[PDB]
Scaffold this active site. Structure first.
Site, PDB file in Angstrom:
ATOM      1  N   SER A 197     -26.115   7.201 -38.251  1.00 50.40           N
ATOM      2  CA  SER A 197     -25.764   9.032 -38.966  1.00 50.40           C
ATOM      3  C   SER A 197     -24.216   9.502 -37.640  1.00 50.40           C
ATOM      4  O   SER A 197     -23.450   8.372 -38.695  1.00 50.40           O
ATOM      5  CB  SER A 197     -27.373   9.655 -37.850  1.00 50.40           C
ATOM      6  OG  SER A 197     -26.433  11.558 -39.046  1.00 50.40           O
ATOM      7  N   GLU A 324     -34.199   9.428 -45.621  1.00 48.75           N
ATOM      8  CA  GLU A 324     -32.914   9.887 -45.115  1.00 48.75           C
ATOM      9  C   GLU A 324     -33.266  11.648 -44.731  1.00 48.75           C
ATOM     10  O   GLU A 324     -32.228  12.429 -43.958  1.00 48.75           O
ATOM     11  CB  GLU A 324     -31.815   9.835 -45.470  1.00 48.75           C
ATOM     12  CG  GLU A 324     -31.316   7.902 -45.238  1.00 48.75           C
ATOM     13  CD  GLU A 324     -30.813   7.989 -43.727  1.00 48.75           C
ATOM     14  OE1 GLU A 324     -31.276   8.593 -42.726  1.00 48.75           O
ATOM     15  OE2 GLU A 324     -31.179   6.392 -43.175  1.00 48.75           O
ATOM     16  N   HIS A 437     -35.114   9.385 -40.782  1.00 49.59           N
ATOM     17  CA  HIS A 437     -33.590   9.358 -40.684  1.00 49.59           C
ATOM     18  C   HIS A 437     -34.017   8.914 -38.546  1.00 49.59           C
ATOM     19  O   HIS A 437     -34.325   9.545 -38.229  1.00 49.59           O
ATOM     20  CB  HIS A 437     -32.603  10.247 -40.983  1.00 49.59           C
ATOM     21  CG  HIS A 437     -32.027  10.616 -39.963  1.00 49.59           C
ATOM     22  ND1 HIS A 437     -30.426   9.650 -41.003  1.00 49.59           N
ATOM     23  CD2 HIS A 437     -30.839  11.453 -39.423  1.00 49.59           C
ATOM     24  CE1 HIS A 437     -29.388   9.963 -40.524  1.00 49.59           C
ATOM     25  NE2 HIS A 437     -29.600  10.518 -39.220  1.00 49.59           N
TER      26      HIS A 437
HETATM   27  C1  LIG Z   1     -30.201  25.753 -35.274  1.00 49.01           C
HETATM   28  O1  LIG Z   1     -29.996  25.163 -36.506  1.00 49.01           O
HETATM   29  C2  LIG Z   1     -30.158  24.107 -37.374  1.00 49.01           C
HETATM   30  C3  LIG Z   1     -30.662  22.689 -36.820  1.00 49.01           C
HETATM   31  C4  LIG Z   1     -31.298  21.869 -37.209  1.00 49.01           C
HETATM   32  C5  LIG Z   1     -30.695  21.660 -38.458  1.00 49.01           C
HETATM   33  C6  LIG Z   1     -29.519  23.165 -39.144  1.00 49.01           C
HETATM   34  C7  LIG Z   1     -29.707  24.134 -38.154  1.00 49.01           C
HETATM   35  O2  LIG Z   1     -29.021  25.335 -38.921  1.00 49.01           O
HETATM   36  C8  LIG Z   1     -28.719  24.974 -40.729  1.00 49.01           C
HETATM   37  C9  LIG Z   1     -30.784  20.469 -39.042  1.00 49.01           C
HETATM   38  O3  LIG Z   1     -30.793  20.337 -39.909  1.00 49.01           O
HETATM   39  C10 LIG Z   1     -31.186  19.915 -37.867  1.00 49.01           C
HETATM   40  C11 LIG Z   1     -31.722  17.935 -38.633  1.00 49.01           C
HETATM   41  C12 LIG Z   1     -32.372  17.385 -36.660  1.00 49.01           C
HETATM   42  C13 LIG Z   1     -32.007  16.212 -37.151  1.00 49.01           C
HETATM   43  C14 LIG Z   1     -32.762  15.081 -36.950  1.00 49.01           C
HETATM   44  N1  LIG Z   1     -32.158  15.330 -35.006  1.00 49.01           N
HETATM   45  C15 LIG Z   1     -32.906  14.427 -34.440  1.00 49.01           C
HETATM   46  C16 LIG Z   1     -32.275  12.991 -34.582  1.00 49.01           C
HETATM   47  C17 LIG Z   1     -30.371  12.774 -34.163  1.00 49.01           C
HETATM   48  C18 LIG Z   1     -30.022  11.792 -34.082  1.00 49.01           C
HETATM   49  C19 LIG Z   1     -29.801  11.044 -34.751  1.00 49.01           C
HETATM   50  C20 LIG Z   1     -31.070  10.803 -35.400  1.00 49.01           C
HETATM   51  C21 LIG Z   1     -32.020  12.131 -35.441  1.00 49.01           C
HETATM   52  C22 LIG Z   1     -33.075  16.259 -35.259  1.00 49.01           C
HETATM   53  C23 LIG Z   1     -32.752  17.706 -35.490  1.00 49.01           C
HETATM   54  C24 LIG Z   1     -30.741  20.832 -37.260  1.00 49.01           C
END
Ligand SMILES: COc1cc2c(cc1OC)C(=O)/C(=C/C1CCN(Cc3ccccc3)CC1)C2
Ligand SMILES: *[C@@H]1O[C@H](CO)[C@@H](O[C@@H]2O[C@H](CO)[C@@H](O[C@@H]3O[C@H](CO)[C@@H](O)[C@H](O[C@H]4O[C@H](CO)[C@@H](O)[C@H](O)[C@@H]4O)[C@@H]3O)[C@H](O)[C@H]2NC(C)=O)[C@H](O)[C@H]1NC(C)=O
Ligand SMILES: *[C@@H]1O[C@H](CO)[C@@H](O[C@@H]2O[C@H](CO)[C@@H](O[C@@H]3O[C@H](CO)[C@@H](O)[C@H](O[C@H]4O[C@H](CO)[C@@H](O)[C@H](O)[C@@H]4O)[C@@H]3O)[C@H](O)[C@H]2NC(C)=O)[C@H](O)[C@H]1NC(C)=O
Ligand SMILES: *[C@@H]1O[C@H](CO)[C@@H](O[C@@H]2O[C@H](CO)[C@@H](O[C@@H]3O[C@H](CO)[C@@H](O)[C@H](O[C@H]4O[C@H](CO)[C@@H](O)[C@H](O)[C@@H]4O)[C@@H]3O)[C@H](O)[C@H]2NC(C)=O)[C@H](O)[C@H]1NC(C)=O
Ligand SMILES: *[C@@H]1O[C@H](CO)[C@@H](O[C@@H]2O[C@H](CO)[C@@H](O[C@@H]3O[C@H](CO)[C@@H](O)[C@H](O[C@H]4O[C@H](CO)[C@@H](O)[C@H](O)[C@@H]4O)[C@@H]3O)[C@H](O)[C@H]2NC(C)=O)[C@H](O)[C@H]1NC(C)=O
Ligand SMILES: COc1cc2c(cc1OC)C(=O)/C(=C/C1CCN(Cc3ccccc3)CC1)C2
Ligand SMILES: *[C@@H]1O[C@H](CO[C@@H]2O[C@@H](C)[C@@H](O)[C@@H](O)[C@@H]2O)[C@@H](O)[C@H](O)[C@H]1NC(C)=O
Ligand SMILES: *[C@@H]1O[C@H](CO[C@@H]2O[C@@H](C)[C@@H](O)[C@@H](O)[C@@H]2O)[C@@H](O)[C@H](O)[C@H]1NC(C)=O
Lengths: 532, 532
Positions: A197, A324, A437
């Site tokens: 990522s 994803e 993802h």
């Molecule tokens: C506090 O505000 C937010 C917090 C988040 C997101 C968006 C937010 O505000 C617009 C978001 O899309 C989020 C998505 C997730 C992405 C994947 N991760 C786990 C992960 C981490 C590293 C590599 C793969 C997966 C969990 C949170 C978290």
């Protein structure tokens, strides 16, 4: 002693760790830079001053200061990504797992964590290097780097907060490995960098950046690429966000020196509390403090670098997971929830579209909607849900990666492309999220080899196979055993564009990975948004 | 006598004609207007002055002056559409086929020929009314009307060449039928108008025009609709073309009266020789002299009339053939030929696209290309060929019809929609052309009932069934027999959008006819071209 290693920064003492009925050595929490604290907050990292005595490297270091997910308290699916150590601005360390007995000159793999450039930790259970180091006889390093505003606040023109310092952190760790891994038994000419990522984007960014290319040999990018729409901003957008961050904390905004001074007085949690307030649009899959296209780390736009071959020419192995988008919809979009099937109304679909493509005018929104709507069945909640999942995945991960891979392959020395579409049998997230993802990472680090973690036998086999592809690629530049009877992963070429599915079934080869949707995102939509 | 009929314009004498082992009466070449010759060229038609004596109606009349296809001399596939009588500006006549014995008050069906508004004839073998009149007990009329510049030259503001006179010709024939068909045994309150291609657009135009609506009861439109992009022009575009026509013939262009006078001195063939020179774009499926949106025949834009319900509310039966585009590609686009499979190169595809959508800017051309390209297989010659066929069919016939039918159904009193996808077994055009524009007409006029013409038994049955649907619809407003055991053609409704396939197989019902492509042509592309 096996656990004593003398390096050019000083001696370090590691610890013997059990792994799958055997043991290896681990050197956890080695410093590679000076702590980036006080008046060094937001500054380029400085090399760690060498120490006398023996640096105790038996335990994991602090994690960098970051946003902590509290959406599903106690739930393992979210908490597996959160910092599992105390957080501190004193967090520039790396970890090394070394086979036992110490090798002489073995292939090195350096892991760069993801987390949207605002979070992540080298210490997570799912990034534990022992299984891979043991199973494949590699020296496995994981580095760390500053995230959030600590890593990426960018006031271009200032030397006190130039931007990109989190990428300079990564580069300083790779310099350290280049300079020192030999003392651990690693071969500094066969260093493969790998990440997921934001970590994958980061790998790509070191391929591109002239000041990092010489430090490694080859590269693996998982679900991330340097041109992802979320992975960088312009220097003007960066400045805008750093000033807005200052506004949120009642800073003096009249100069860089007044703003930075104000920002350096704040406790780390104060910055984190308002970090999400600076985003310019209501959006999903968008993070506030990310790499900046500065003229220095990146000498020109990423697209001109890619088009002109201004990048390291080597072998790359890379790919994407099937679903994803799902995580970002769950966390960011209305109508997606963790304990519901999350069927989506037309109205939540249209809202979702607008959140997914924040920079788009109305015609652009109608183009995306058209591209993903089945007009024979436009009220199917399932289709709408899966359709948004695809929009998010395609726009943010898959299509940027496809564009990267097509551009890179023109000049590079060997490309292997995968599509990971096996959903783990013990996945605790709901089914609607599919092959999420991040959930190839456990296979790459060999967690399914551990009985207690409740994977199937076929998942164990899949993990063994993935690990061996990743490590043979790192060793030789080719994930296949030269004279195996096993089925061959073919090279992705410009003409034929081959890739493989990674799953528990017999290997299949295909061509032109999501090409229909990627022509839309990579060629047509940008043209559309440019003409309006 | 059965062959003598006294009408309000005078007496006429017809002729007994054999048909399928029986006989009926035919009254061929009855005049309905004064010959539109000399200083009446380009003028509104005038009613035929009544005659003393008996008007000999035993033989077909002249065809109107028109372009004659010489592309495939002697080839029956093209020559079946060309005038089979002498051409003359003295060509406003109609033909009536009447069952024997003379009915008292039977359902009347009035056929309006197609031919792109620049050609066509009521006398073609394939429009011979005897089979339908005999088999279904209807009085079958075919009218004629001026085409080309003689019918459609438009200098709005002038009374000498107002435009639309060919549509006023049709309306004058329908007035005549309204006033006189009773003397033939027809029922003037159950007059169904039906036509193909330009004839279908023409039917639609009489549904819309306030000055024609009262003259008929209901309507059948085959592969044509009044909003087709080729079927009308603005008054400015009409004026432009009439002035360019004048330029081509070295006319004085300083006033309407100078231009018209000049155009009226020319022999008919001189106008026809240069008619195709006035089109503003290099284009296919575009004809020079067509109906004009004048404020009079059409009081406002066709779209505002359709949206506000400014049209006759009645029952309509209508549909399209599967491969509407093929004829126009054959005649108009590079790489399509009659004796080749006509596989098309990317370059002939892209040229074809540009010819197909002449009013489109580059982004619009990229949108159409994207919508019809399979990017997994973008060099397949067959796909490119079929893809252009679909572009042409969709843009010009199917999607305008779908839009018409959806708008009409909101206010109307009953809609039946078909998709004709049976390719005649004896078709002399090549296979690549599929189910060609025009080739349902033979089924509607019952040609397959004639053994010599070499159709199969199943085609005969299909024709019987079509004829009976068309005639029962004309009689009652519903193509189904109230208490049949046969499968029912359901009504097209706003919500469910049902239609049937017409072919030799058991009836299938479907919904939302080419909806995916029609949202593109009817909603997205126009929005795109408006924003640029
Ligand atoms: C506090 O505000 C937010 C917090 C988040 C997101 C968006 C937010 O505000 C617009 C978001 O899309 C989020 C998505 C997730 C992405 C994947 N991760 C786990 C992960 C981490 C590293 C590599 C793969 C997966 C969990 C949170 C978290
Ligand atoms: C990754 O990069 C490596 C290293 O640069 C690259 O390997 C190179 O492959 C080419 C083959 O394309 C080799 O070039 C050949 O060398 C021989 C003898 O040394 C020459 O005789 C060859 O010339 C003949 O064949 C040519 C056809 O390519 C003809 O053009 C010519 O007229 C002759 O008949 C030819 O120049 C090159 O030496 C290697 N180098 C090494 C160390 O192997 C590799 O292919 C790249 N991999 C990918 C996936 O890109
Ligand atoms: C591999 O699979 C095994 C087999 O299924 C699995 O073991 C299960 O783990 C969970 C651990 O949470 C156990 O559930 C607990 O059981 C006890 C005793 O009955 C309860 O007191 C617990 O309830 C508390 O916590 C709940 C949820 O967190 C609260 O909602 C509640 O109020 C209590 O606070 C809890 O339900 C479960 O007993 C076992 N099942 C079996 C059959 O052993 C193991 O965890 C999996 N391994 C891994 C590494 O995931
Ligand atoms: C084509 O047009 C025809 C003719 O206009 C049209 O037929 C009409 O259908 C409606 C049914 O929707 C008829 O209206 C009904 O008439 C009866 C008795 O005359 C009334 O009692 C009805 O009221 C009851 O039912 C209503 C439900 O619609 C309730 O709203 C109401 O509260 C009562 O319980 C009702 O008004 C109308 O009379 C006919 N006319 C004829 C001559 O049949 C036909 O449906 C149209 N076809 C299509 C496809 O559009
Ligand atoms: C229904 O099907 C039947 C059975 O197939 C079909 O009859 C065929 O029609 C054509 C009529 O053109 C005949 O072909 C001609 O035959 C004679 C004698 O052998 C030739 O002299 C002709 O050649 C001249 O014309 C050619 C083409 O136009 C020229 O290229 C050449 O130089 C000559 O000028 C011509 O080939 C054919 O014989 C019959 N076949 C049979 C088996 O009877 C009939 O036409 C179909 N019916 C309908 C209404 O379509
Ligand atoms: C002289 O210039 C042209 C001539 C033509 C076309 C285009 C032309 O220039 C741009 C054309 O598309 C043409 C198409 C065909 C339409 C279908 N007809 C047969 C037919 C007539 C009436 C109803 C159905 C089919 C044959 C000609 C003919
Ligand atoms: C090295 O560290 C081991 C674990 O250390 C733990 O954390 C550090 C920060 C201390 O607070 C320590 O007391 C904790 O146990 C020790 O068990 C080990 O004794 C240490 N070895 C040496 C030589 O210092
Ligand atoms: C009516 O017409 C029949 C066919 O007429 C033919 O064409 C007309 C224009 C004449 O030129 C004619 O000689 C042709 O045969 C005639 O056979 C028939 O005799 C005519 N009947 C009457 C009463 O005039």
């Amino acid at each position: 002693s096996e656990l004593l290693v003398n390096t050019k920064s000083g001696k370090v003492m590691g610890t013997r760790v059990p792994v799958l009925s055997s043991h290896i050595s681990a050197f956890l929490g080695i410093p590679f830079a000076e702590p980036p604290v006080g008046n060094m907050r937001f500054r380029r990292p400085e090399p760690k001053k060498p120490w006398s005595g023996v640096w105790n490297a038996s335990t994991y270091p602090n994690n960098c200061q970051q946003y902590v997910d509290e959406q599903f308290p106690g739930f393992s699916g979210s908490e597996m990504w959160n910092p599992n150590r105390e957080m501190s601005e004193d967090c520039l360390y790396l970890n090394i797992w070394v086979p036992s007995p110490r090798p002489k000159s073995t292939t090195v793999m350096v892991w760069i964590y993801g987390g949207g450039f605002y979070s992540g930790s080298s210490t997570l259970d799912v990034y534990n290097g022992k299984y891979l180091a043991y199973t494949e006889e590699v020296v496995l390093v994981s580095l760390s780097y500053r995230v959030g505003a600590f890593g990426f606040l960018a006031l271009h023109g200032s030397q006190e907060a130039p931007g990109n310092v989190g990428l300079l952190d990564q580069r300083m760790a790779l310099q350290w490995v280049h300079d020192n891994i030999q003392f651990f038994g690693g071969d500094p000419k066969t260093v493969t960098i790998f990440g997921e990522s934001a970590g994958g984007a980061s790998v790509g960014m070191h391929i591109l950046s002239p000041g990092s290319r010489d430090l490694f040999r080859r590269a693996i990018l998982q679900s991330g690429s340097p041109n992802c729409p979320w992975a960088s901003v312009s220097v003007a957008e960066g400045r805008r966000r750093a000033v807005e961050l200052g506004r949120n904390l009642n800073c003096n905004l009249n100069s860089d020196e007044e703003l930075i001074h104000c920002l350096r007085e704040k406790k780390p949690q104060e910055l984190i509390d308002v970090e999400w307030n600076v985003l310019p649009f209501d959006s999903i899959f968008r993070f506030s403090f990310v790499p900046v296209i500065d003229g220095e780390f990146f000498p020109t736009s990423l697209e001109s670098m890619l088009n002109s071959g201004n990048f390291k020419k080597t072998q790359i192995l890379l790919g994407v997971n099937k679903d994803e988008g799902s995580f970002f919809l769950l966390y960011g979009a209305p109508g997606f929830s963790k304990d519901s099937e999350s069927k989506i109304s037309r109205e939540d679909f249209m809202s979702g579209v607008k959140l997914s493509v924040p920079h788009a005018n109305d015609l652009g929104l109608d183009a995306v909607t058209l591209q993903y709507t089945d007009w024979m069945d436009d009220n199917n909640g399932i289709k709408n849900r899966d359709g948004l999942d695809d929009i998010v995945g395609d726009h943010n991960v898959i299509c940027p990666l496809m564009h990267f891979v097509n551009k890179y392959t023109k000049f590079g020395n060997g490309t292997y492309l995968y599509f990971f579409n096996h959903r783990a049998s013990n996945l605790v997230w709901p089914e609607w999220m599919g092959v999420i993802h991040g959930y190839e990472i456990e296979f790459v680090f060999g967690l399914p080899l551990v009985k207690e973690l409740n994977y199937t036998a076929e998942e164990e086999a899949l993990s063994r196979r993935i690990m061996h592809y990743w490590a043979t690629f790192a060793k030789t530049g080719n994930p296949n055993e030269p004279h195996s009877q096993e089925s061959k992963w073919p090279l992705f070429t410009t003409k034929e564009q081959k890739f493989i599915d990674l799953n528990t079934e017999p290997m299949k080869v295909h061509q032109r990975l999501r090409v229909q949707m990627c022509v839309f995102w990579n060629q047509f939509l940008p043209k559309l948004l440019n003409a309006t």
